[PDB]
């Protein structure tokens, strides 16, 4: 029930952190997640991640028996929240999308080993802020990203890859958030990969020109023609009601 300054409440999952325990700080009442391991290198890399929309490490406690990571609490998943509601407004989707794009841009500027964005790593906290779980140590089910989010250049292997794969991922996420369905949908793997490689998908007509236009430039098969993260951040549609704290230093 007690560990350092924390009082254990219940167990939940937090994306790539797996099973964690919700705990309350014993003086401030702050909610926290405790990841108990019964690693050195993975902690150091996580300590480097300081963005408002990436899950933060607060502290590490040594139980001389177990290592306990004290990480940011986020008890919901973004896609759950999207599903458990009716079609959300373009402005709600953009709000979430801005937070994600900023976290991605941050990852690019610092030299952070690329992690395929997984739908299950997109968590939501109580402020309805996106919190990306970025951690890498379950694994008997799948060892790779969702095929539905994989870029043509990865799928074909025929090309090499870079930071433009994140633009493709983010383009699928943006499509999912606006349309409540996957752009590339197929039940059969080889069929799904054929549609992805050829860029075959439908843009619903209920979309605004701004939203449809941005998606269309993110879901470009040739990665050298794909819009960059930095240009996404200057897009007319993207920029609407954009909080300043999300901008990279050069755009502030």
Curated annotation (Swiss-Prot):
Domain of life from the UniProt record: Eukaryota
Domain Protein kinase, first and last residues per copy: 6-238
Compartments reported by the entry: Cytoplasm; Nucleus; Nucleus membrane
Active-site residues from the entry: 116
Modification Phosphothreonine, positions: 142
Mutagenesis / variant outcome for changing residue 35 to R: Inactivates the kinase activity without affecting protein levels
Binding site for ATP: 12-20, 35
Coiled coil: none
Post-translational modifications: Phosphorylation at Thr-142 in response to glucose limitation leads to activation of kinase activity. ADP, but not AMP, protects the enzyme from dephosphorylation at Thr-142 by GLC7.
Induction context: Expression of the SNF1 gene itself is not glucose repressible.
Family named by the database record: Belongs to the protein kinase superfamily. CAMK Ser/Thr protein kinase family. SNF1 subfamily.
Quaternary structure and partners: Component of the AMP-activated protein kinase complex also known as the SNF1 kinase complex (Snf1c), a heterotrimeric complex composed of an alpha subunit (SNF1), a regulatory subunit beta (GAL83 and substoichiometric alternate beta subunits SIP1 and SIP2), and a regulatory subunit gamma (SNF4). Interacts with the transcriptional activator SIP4. Interacts with SAK1. Interacts with CTK1: Interacts with adenylate cyclase CYR1.
Function summary: Serine/threonine protein kinase essential for release from glucose repression. Catalytic subunit of the AMP-activated protein kinase complex also known as the SNF1 kinase complex (Snf1c), a central regulator of cellular energy homeostasis, which, in response to a fall in intracellular ATP levels, activates energy-producing pathways and inhibits energy-consuming processes. The complex phosphorylates histone H3 to form H3S10ph, which promotes H3K14ac formation, leading to transcriptional activation through TBP recruitment to the promoters.
Further facts: Present with 589 molecules/cell in log phase SD medium.
Domain characteristics, as noted in the entry: The regulatory domain (RS) also called auto-inhibitory domain (AID) inhibits kinase activity of the protein kinase domain (KD). The AID is sequestered by SNF4 within the AMP-activated protein kinase complex which might correspond to the activated SNF1 form. The ubiquitin-associated domain (UBA) localized within the AID dampens kinase activation, probably by restraining SNF1-SNF4 associations. Moreover, the UBA domain influences life span in a FKH1- and FKH2-dependent mechanism.
Name listed for the protein in its UniProt record: Carbon catabolite-derepressing protein kinase
Organism expressing this protein natively: Saccharomyces cerevisiae (strain ATCC 204508 / S288c) (Baker's yeast)
Lineage of producing organism: Eukaryota, Fungi, Dikarya, Ascomycota, Saccharomycotina
Chain's gene name: SNF1
Segment of the intact protein contained: 50 to 320 of 633
């Amino acid at each position: 029930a007690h560990i350092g300054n924390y009082q254990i409440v219940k167990t939940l999952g937090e994306g790539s952190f797996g099973k964690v325990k919700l705990a309350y700080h014993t003086t401030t009442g702050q909610k926290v997640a405790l990841k108990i391991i019964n690693i050195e290198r993975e902690i150091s890399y996580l300590r480097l991640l300081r963005h408002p929309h990436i899950i933060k490490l607060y502290d590490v406690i040594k139980s001389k028996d177990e290592i306990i990571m004290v990480i940011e609490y986020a008890g919901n998943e973004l896609f759950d929240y999207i599903v458990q509601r009716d079609k959300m407004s373009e402005q709600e989707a953009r709000r979430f999308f801005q937070q994600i794009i900023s976290a991605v841009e941050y990852c690019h500027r610092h030299k952070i080993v690329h992690r395929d964005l997984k739908p299950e790593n997109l968590l939501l906290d109580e402020h309805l802020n996106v919190k990306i779980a970025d951690f890498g140590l379950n694994f008997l089910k799948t060892s790779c990203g969702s095929p539905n989010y994989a870029a043509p250049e990865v799928i074909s292997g025929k090309l090499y890859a870079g930071p433009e794969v994140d633009v493709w991922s983010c383009g699928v996420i943006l499509y999912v958030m606006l349309c409540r369905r996957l752009p590339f949908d197929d039940e059969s793997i080889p069929v799904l990969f054929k549609n992805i490689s050829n860029g075959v998908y439908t843009l619903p007509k209920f979309l605004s020109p701004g939203a449809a236009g941005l998606i269309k430039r993110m879901l470009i098969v040739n990665p050298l023609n794909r819009i960059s993260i930095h240009e996404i951040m200057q897009d007319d549609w993207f920029k609407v009601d954009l909080p300043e704290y999300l901008l990279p230093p050069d755009l502030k």
